Nucleic acid binder design. Structure first.
Lengths: 120, 56, 209, 114, 122
RNA sequence: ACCGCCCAAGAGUUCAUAUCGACGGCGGUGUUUGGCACCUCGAUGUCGGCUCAUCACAUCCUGGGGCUGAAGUAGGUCCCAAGGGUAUGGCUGUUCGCCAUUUAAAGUGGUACGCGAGCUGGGUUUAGAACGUCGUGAGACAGUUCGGUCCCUAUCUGCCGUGGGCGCUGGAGAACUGAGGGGGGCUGCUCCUAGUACGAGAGGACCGGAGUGGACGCAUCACUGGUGUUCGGGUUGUCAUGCCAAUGGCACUGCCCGGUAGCUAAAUGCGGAAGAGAUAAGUGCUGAAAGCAUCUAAGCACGAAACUUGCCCCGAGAUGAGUUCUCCCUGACCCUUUAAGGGUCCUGAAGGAACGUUGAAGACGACGACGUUGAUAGGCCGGGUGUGUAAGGACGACCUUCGG
RNA sequence: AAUGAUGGCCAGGCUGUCUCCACCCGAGACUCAGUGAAAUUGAACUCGCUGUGAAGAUGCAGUGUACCCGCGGCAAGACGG
RNA sequence: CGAAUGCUGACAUAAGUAACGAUAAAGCGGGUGAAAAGCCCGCUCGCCGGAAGACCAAGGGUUCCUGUCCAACGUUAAUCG
């Protein structure tokens, strides 16, 4: 039964579902790349991509908001200052999906996700 | 809550007959160096859609 | 007057002049087409094969292309036979209008219902509940007894058992008439057709007379 | 969605009045009495609002000389002929379920006369 | 919407403030009956000098149930509390002589025409 | 034992079968109380409740039909007829039972006195303690009261759904037949034709026209709600976050006031059927046999919800492989246990497939849409659910001569 | 008198105990990876229906029906353990 | 020597299924490596705080530290213990 819903369960707790995406929230700004599980990365897009729409707005609230989730005012200071001019005029498409194997530790499907422009 | 008579040898195969593994065989051949790479996957050299992404 | 079936657009509550409420089925039917002869002549029983809708140029496959190429027709979403009622009778290839429901006063609905997968038996057949307390031993929803003892000792075929139900064709006939727009090709009917919304469900003039 | 969009884009009401969750409300609902038609009052407050267009709602809470007969109207069903405001309310939230058990001497809310 | 032993208030001047649903009329298994339904019920109290005494039993002509009342547009005029008006055995009509509070126009058919003569509401 | 029936006292006001019957007579079934001990004592768990059933018909209502000491009504009785239907509470472990009140009406019986590898344990056969009684006791009572442990991860049969494989004598994509199967067969009530028929009168029609049930099955958000821990606002303290401004957490989401879209019923449409056939009961047609005659023996009409059609749906692996529409396409060698033959050089067509972006399709599978071209999904511009007056800047005044 | 995790009954309050169930959040149940058990076991190519029989049949006589093999469920039977 | 619910030794069987020992939670850079989720450093999270902190007694017998190895052990991998 899942007509018309959005989100995921992912063996994970809402507040932690809430949180466990958190640290990334500013994080992958910091290095711009990882390996990750695609569905999570897929969702990480859904985790990040929707969050990345944040990447277009600088005023007081967001400063709390980007600090608001992932609990940090580090990365927020970054975007406030630096990345704004990067994606001036794109209808999205700020990250890109690249398949890279399977975690040798667990057979899980490996995935590199990176900013469409990336470029730390 | 148990079998009541011990099954035959031959049956055991048939139950095992659909569990046969399936081969991939759909290899994809890249355009830059030609290193065999899975279709839709960055190469072992980290290549996909032809370009050198990442860099390792 | 053969029936006309559409995509289960959705539904509405149709509003009137004097306090009349009409929550009606909403459905899409394009200009229909009968595409072949079925009768004595080539099969011995009479039927009218009908496809409606459209397909994207590249996907009309040569034999079906030939099927439509031999037909020389646009692609439609599916070919249906309307069994010829001695006034019913068609031959290949005609693109159809909807006037065939001039009065009807009742039509059908038959098509894939809402997706459900393994529905619960409590829902499929309106079974009962056991009590939720006073020593219930893990049986808040089981079906309970099904059959007899050392006498016939077998399970009668057809027994209503819980499982997948719905999400499939469903004939809905003898259905009051409310309203249509031929100019828009909707069908808006007091009472809402089965299936998933957006479905096709066989809408035909009443067979219960 | 573009099917009924034109279908019922022409069936939602034409000139609905002012209310909030807690504004005073009275749906003159043409009801059956004898052999002639007339208008009979159902004056109340909104405790619950539904911004859903034609199938929406705007709530009326009367007091029926002690026990009301409670009404969930259709703003956009022509069975609601019209609304005539006696006063609006001063509300905070969306749904004034509190408007009921609040009675008599305290049952009032001030006018949000702004 | 009156069911076995439904809490029952009284809309009448008989004194009894007490009634309780025990049997619906009109057809077997009739479950949720109200509005204009008549059912078998029993009186549990009255006023001191009323026309009924503790224990007298009768049926019902409903005028209120917590479920309120539907109307032409799907709209409903809904009841706040389950208060009712009983009926005679033979003459029908509420055993009383003065009735008060909401009834239902759905009881309007000239059979309960007696009440519809002089009410404060409906 | 029960039911069934045979005789005819007699009754019955008449009349032995309107409806009863002496004394005697002959059956049927196998359900009550019984007999017998052939199987189970290296285990076949007891009473009753709860959910789910199923058939027989010695017919409860409905249907039909006959008769009747059956005027309408309401009975009594006999033949046909098994499609559908078949109460809610109090009292006690109870079944039983009784009782209160309803209805068309609360039919009788088999199935290990159905059903514990689906539930419970209140009763009845364990250890504690009591009273009456009975014996010197030990203890007993088939006399009575308080308390007290219930296990199974489903091999096979079976049954509900859902796939892979192979064949149908070339391959591929469409539309098919309808052998055969399965769900439905309620009606209550009330109003008009008809206080008319009957019936003195009462009261009460036949066959027919109008309205409502309630139960029941299919359908849908499209009311009405509900809900909705991702949609909002108000709050208790505090962790603490360079301190006035803001956090997040934590406190069951901290408590509380709300709630999309969908999903849903108390909300809203829908249906019981119309139709034909055959009849049946039983009665109706002619018919002599037996000069009559007759429902019978030959040639003629009707007859129920009971059976073949009318309705839905399923449905050619119907191995009897049924029916029509398409279109893909017709390579060089040899060789022998030389033919429906094995092997060497060109060719891979329809299509399919696979990996990718996906949905009211979903356990998986399986299906659907769709594969950059991809509107497939998201992302960027217009929508506006639901919450319900954010936070922050400033502003001045607010407080003193003005604000009266 | 007072007392009681004491016996039996009747009032008030209360509410999903029930007519009659609806939605939502969590942990399993399902797919992929790795490791990896037990009770049980004459032998088996392991259909229904009437009847007969150490007297209640998968395996007897007569008789109808049925392409090969999985996967998710259910618990009448195998006098199941 | 076939049968004694004989005894001892070896191999089947259900099944590649149940199960993987508290519902306090994790995330990313950098290092090694034949080979990082589980090891080290770094930067973030969250939980306990009359304890999941610090110290005696009894009991225990080298488990303490440094180098060094990956057969078996560790309910998986292991540069680790």
């Amino acid at each position: 039964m899942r007509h018309r819903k959005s989100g995921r369960q992912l063996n994970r707790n809402s507040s932690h579902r809430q949180a466990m995406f958190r640290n990334m929230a500013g994080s992958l700004v910091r290095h711009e790349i990882i390996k990750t599980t695609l569905p999570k990365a897929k969702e990480l897009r859904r985790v990040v991509e929707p969050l990345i729409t944040l990447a277009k707005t600088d005023s007081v609230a967001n400063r709390r908001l980007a600090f608001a989730r992932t609990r940090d005012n580090e990365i927020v200071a970054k975007l406030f200052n630096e990345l704004g001019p990067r994606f001036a005029s794109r209808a999205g498409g700020y990250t890109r999906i690249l398949k890279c194997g399977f975690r040798a530790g667990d057979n899980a499907p490996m995935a590199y996700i990176e900013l469409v422009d990336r470029s730390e | 809550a148990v079998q009541q008579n011990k099954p035959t040898r031959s049956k055991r195969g048939m139950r095992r007959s659909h569990d046969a593994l399936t081969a991939v065989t759909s290899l994809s051949v890249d355009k830059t160096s030609g290193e065999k790479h899975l279709r839709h996957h960055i190469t072992a050299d980290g290549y996909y859609r032809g370009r050198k992404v990442i860099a390792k | 007057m053969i029936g006309l079936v559409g995509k289960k657009v959705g539904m509405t509550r149709i509003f009137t002049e004097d306090g009349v409420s009409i929550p009606v089925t909403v459905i899409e039917v394009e200009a229909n087409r009968v595409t072949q002869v079925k009768d004595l002549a080539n099969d011995g029983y009479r039927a009218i094969q009908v496809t409606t809708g459209a397909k994207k140029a590249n996907r009309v496959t040569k034999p079906e292309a030939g099927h439509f190429a031999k037909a020389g027709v646009e692609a439609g979403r599916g070919l249906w036979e309307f069994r010829l009622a001695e006034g019913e009778e068609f031959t290949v290839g005609q693109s159809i209008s909807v006037e065939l429901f001039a009065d009807v006063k009742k039509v059908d609905v038959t098509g894939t219902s809402k997706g459900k997968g393994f529905a619960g038996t409590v829902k499929r057949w309106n079974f009962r509940t056991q009590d939720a307390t006073h020593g219930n031993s893990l049986s808040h929803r089981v079906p309970g007894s099904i059959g007899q003892n050392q006498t016939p000792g077998k399970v009668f075929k057809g027994k209503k058992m819980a499982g997948q139900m719905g999400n499939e064709r469903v004939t809905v006939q003898s259905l009051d008439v409310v309203r249509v727009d031929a100019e828009r090709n909707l069908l808006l009917v007091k009472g809402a057709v089965p299936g998933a919304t957006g479905s096709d469900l066989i809408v035909k003039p009443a067979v219960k007379a | 969605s573009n099917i009924i969009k034109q279908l019922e884009q022409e069936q939602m009401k034409q000139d609905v009045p002012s209310f909030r969750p807690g504004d005073t409300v009275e749906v003159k609902v043409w009801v059956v009495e004898g052999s002639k038609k007339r208008l009979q009052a159902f004056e109340g407050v909104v405790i619950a609002i539904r911004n859903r267009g034609l199938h929406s709602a705007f709530t009326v809470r009367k007091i029926s000389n002690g026990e009301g007969v409670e009404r969930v109207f259709q703003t956009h069903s022509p069975v609601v002929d019209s609304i005539s405001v006696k006063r609006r309310g001063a509300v905070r939230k969306a749904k004034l379920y509190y408007l009921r058990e609040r009675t008599g001497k305290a049952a009032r809310i001030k006018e949000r006369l702004n | 919407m009156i069911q076995e032993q439904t809490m029952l208030n009284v809309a009448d001047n008989s004194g009894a403030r007490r009634v309780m649903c025990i049997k619906v009329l009109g057809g077997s298994h009739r479950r949720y009956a109200g509005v204009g339904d008549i059912i078998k019920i029993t009186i549990k109290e009255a006023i001191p000098r009323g026309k009924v005494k503790k224990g007298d039993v009768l049926k019902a002509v409903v005028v209120r149930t917590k479920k309120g009342v539907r109307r032409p547009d799907g709209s409903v005029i809904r009841f706040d509390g389950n208060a009712c008006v009983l009926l005679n055995n033979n003459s029908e009509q509420p055993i009383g002589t003065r009735i008060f509070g909401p009834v239902t126009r759905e009881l309007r058919s000239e059979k309960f025409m007696k009440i519809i003569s002089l009410a404060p509401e409906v």
